[PDB]
Amino acid sequence: SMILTQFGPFIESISGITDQSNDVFENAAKAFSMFTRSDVYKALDEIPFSEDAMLPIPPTIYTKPSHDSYYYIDALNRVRRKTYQGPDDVYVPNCSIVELLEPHETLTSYGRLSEAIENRAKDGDSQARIATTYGRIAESQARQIKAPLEKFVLALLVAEAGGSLYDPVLQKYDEIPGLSHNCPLWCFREICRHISGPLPDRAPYLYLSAGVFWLMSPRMTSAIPPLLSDLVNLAILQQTAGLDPSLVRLGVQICLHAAASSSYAWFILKTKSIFPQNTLHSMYESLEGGYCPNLEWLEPRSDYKFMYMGAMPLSTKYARSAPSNDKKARELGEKYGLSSVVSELRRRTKTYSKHDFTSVRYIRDAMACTSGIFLVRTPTETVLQEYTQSPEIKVPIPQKDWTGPIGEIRILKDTTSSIARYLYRTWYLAAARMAAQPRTWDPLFQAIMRSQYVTARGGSGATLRESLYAINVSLPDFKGLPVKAATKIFQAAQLANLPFSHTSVAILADTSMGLRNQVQRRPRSIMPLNVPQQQVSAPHTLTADYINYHMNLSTTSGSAVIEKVIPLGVYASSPPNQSINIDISACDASITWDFFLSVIMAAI
Amino acid sequence: VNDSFSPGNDFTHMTTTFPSGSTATSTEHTANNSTMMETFLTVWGPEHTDDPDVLRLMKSLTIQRNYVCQGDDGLMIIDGNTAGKVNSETIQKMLELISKYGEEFGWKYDIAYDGTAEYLKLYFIFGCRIPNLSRHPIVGKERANSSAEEPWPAILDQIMGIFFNGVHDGLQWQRWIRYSWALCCAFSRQRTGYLQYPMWSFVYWGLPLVKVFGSDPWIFSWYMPTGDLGMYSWISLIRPLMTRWMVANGYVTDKCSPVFGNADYRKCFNELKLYQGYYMAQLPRNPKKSGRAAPREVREQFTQALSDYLMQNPELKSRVLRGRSEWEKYGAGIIHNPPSLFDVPHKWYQGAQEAATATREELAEMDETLMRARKHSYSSFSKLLEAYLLVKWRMCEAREPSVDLRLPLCAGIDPLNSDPFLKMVSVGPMLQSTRKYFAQTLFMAKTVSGLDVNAIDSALLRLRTLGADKKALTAQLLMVGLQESEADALAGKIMLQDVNTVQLARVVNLAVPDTWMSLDFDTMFKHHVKLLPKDGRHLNTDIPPRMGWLRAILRFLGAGMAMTATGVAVDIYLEDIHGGGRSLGQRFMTWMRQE
Amino acid sequence: PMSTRIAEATSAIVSKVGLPPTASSGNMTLTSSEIQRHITEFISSWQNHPIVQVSADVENRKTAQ
């Protein structure tokens, strides 16, 4: 009730009750600004929950082992995590962290990583290096949130204090259960209560600008900071989308099982196709009705001319004829101790036999119930796991099917029995039709294509300068000016007067690294090539552009759902014309110099 | 690899994987995918199969007709025959053949045959889109290194992005709007003194508002155009009630205004902080670390280096010098800042300086700018908004439906979600890829990096509308680098031709909002917005035959109102222009002679 | 449940004879009733479509036979 007492006018303003003015907005903003986290948790405790909001919590989330038995030191003096389940168990362990905390000043009940262990790792100790690597990795995992989570929780509380909202079009209130039925929010409250214990402070951790502080307690582990964000996401989605309680309870069960396992990120990666494979992949085993769009997209194909002609009723013979997805789903549910959730999903899916709005909304809820977090792992491990796999070619091109070397390229004779002949022919015709086609010689085109890669962003300039100075060629330096010295524009300015003969040495330079996380998928490493290294690969991208523009039916679509080929999916998903999803696993390591590049360079 | 999370973990590594982040990666990936699928469908397939039905299926489809590939992923379409849908067993055998074929050259196709479609992380079943809510987290943000987070205006931008992502995913509109306003209020205040953003700034940023001035609650939708058009739309929707509310409490002025009448809108808006929020929302939300002091002749040799790098071929430099010569001869400063190839080094220098850490003084300057903008008092709006408010519209009859009301096109939108359902049913989804449709509008396909094609086309169209000799356009195109003959021909073409509303709209800085791009807006812009009033010519809405570009601006002025209001999209007719078409065109021209 | 909720919402939004008629039976703002009248006009226009008037999603007892 303290939320009401301290926010009375604001809820009435934003719930359509009274007018929406500026003074109320500013007063509410000030109250948001001055609101302690412990007060947020007290207001959270004031919630009178009900049953149907309570799901048992295993006792094993809190009691976890240490980190020493999970890492080791291999040859070449490198730190990496030993694997217990296959080669993908390289993510963050769920072990405890308490013994690595030293209390921070100005507040006793919070601490950070100790500087003693940091120094002992700096000067060369092994266990200290392991401890500091684990601490920094846990810090990075906990630092994957936009803003302190208590702000989002308090905003949800304030927004949902208004209750049901009237609908001007439907002329009735919206029937959505209140916060008393919010399972993830109750789980959040219970976890925070259990971690806090006798200590007056209630926040499991506080998120600052650079670095976060851990509230030391024997029940604190490393799986809490992603779990809290996951539960808050689930609660917000339930409140703002009308998710049914059962699916959200199943999602919370999955999240808690992931937390109680050996590694949260590894478990959530292993179980990322539970809902989409049980619900989306198994509906309409028996149809009796519904409507589907009668799309028809015209004979001009490269332009994507789609036409819509009414809707046709669904016949009974348009059932699900795809092979059943039962065996592998049941096996996966049995392997990871999720049999109950899988059985519930499979039983619930079969009850929808008509393609109305309700089935689509159920599918949307099921797909929404999955856990979305940014998986994180040590860069030296993603590098060692992604860049060591190599393609497996069972029928390589015979040695007798090549010729003498044109410098460092051997042309492939068209008498070969291998399948690469057609690829070579297609690329050869593409290159010829490019070379004869005349716009590739106007100086504006060359200037544009030379300025494509010149961007205000890093391009491994240190390696460039090292490699170019290795041949005693000196490049100018600029000091005293406030421009960044680690960008490709700096490299372009440095490589102005130099001819191509001197800068050709830098082509063989060693590229620097890059990394970025992704939702429910392993992080991707990126290697930015220096400016001449971008330059040297111009004909390849140009003939590829020619291929993708004229020879094939393809698209080079944009980043957002608005700039995408939505019609094509609607056409391909209609019941009369079923479709097949084809994906290539690890396409980065797919093409190498053995087959693909070897054919392509000669063809060009 | 020189990481930071593990001390003493620097090393080197030799790898054979094709580089990611290079220019050529996605294009060659897609090309190779298409070529290998084609050769499988042609030669390898029939050479390794036995059943007649699978051979009949394989001889029927080709990549030119039914196969769409983008990079790693791909999608193949099997069309239905006269006897229903193709048998599943043949498809399963063909997929087994594909799996066998892919391993010969080191590929492992991840093939799923489930009766649905997946492409670019889009899920469709029975011709109905399904947004994956979990793939767009609300509190998540990826961070690789251990760098500190950006200041508070950045989190403001992030909250706005969260709201837009919720819009695209189709949430419960009333509850989502309320929660977005809650976050808006929560993150609106920051100390240094304290700084606050008045609600009206957030409304200008595109967040719809619920109930003001005693109107009916839940009256505006979130299809509101962001920006100036958006302010006009809701203000013109609720103006006759705004004036009444203003007069009812202590806001009366003897002077009569063509827009608001006898209501002292100036004092009311200044007290309500509406001007303050509107103007503050336009200020940059990042520190102005660009323009920081630099010792001279060093920036000069830097800029000279970029100039030499950009232009190695003498003939292009000759073209640019000519373009400048006839620009000085004819341009005569009609447009203030014509884009040119010589200013590319300056833009590159600014961009390279921008990607850097900002000192405390830059943040102090930013906070001082926000405080000064908040404390100041403004007499009137921007010129564009005042010009927009001079136009009045009328809404008589709703459009006939364009989609059957029983056809589920997308998840989340249904009778429980009244506004998006009615909007999509009345307007209709866009059945054409937006990329090609937007591409066909541009005069020039691509330009050098550091310049904007939109800026070049806007300059060209401003030089058409503000009267200028053809030679000025030829000089501008030469300054862009086009050849003299082609520049002359293109200028001659541009002088007389007419162009669709989008390009003309760009002349005054108007673009289709990213929210509308999921609906079929083009048909509404063409047909269902009529400039001729429902009762004939009024002798006041008389657009002159000169300045005929006013029609596109009027089309968006009407369409913003037609799309902002909740419920069914309604046909909208032009009613009146206060000062007259020629006066409004003169206002637009006198704004064009700025910037 | 969601099924009956959707059915109720659809009935509320959509639902609103041969006999001769009898005597017995400028500054426009935006208003709830003003939106409702457009909604009614739109739904009447949809309902008066010849294909919609006879379209059905499930076959009756004799069309199947």
Binding site: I17, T18, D19, Y166 | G214, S215, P217, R244 | -
Partner: peptide, 26 residues
């Protein structure tokens, strides 16, 4: 015949929103 209404508004019973004037309310 144009009759705008000002002041002395109150609440509505069907929907608990607060209106501007009694005539707008009815």
């Amino acid at each position: 015949p144009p009759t705008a209404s000002s002041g002395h508004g109150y609440q509505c019973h069907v929907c608990s929103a607060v209106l501007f004037s009694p005539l707008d309310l009815d």
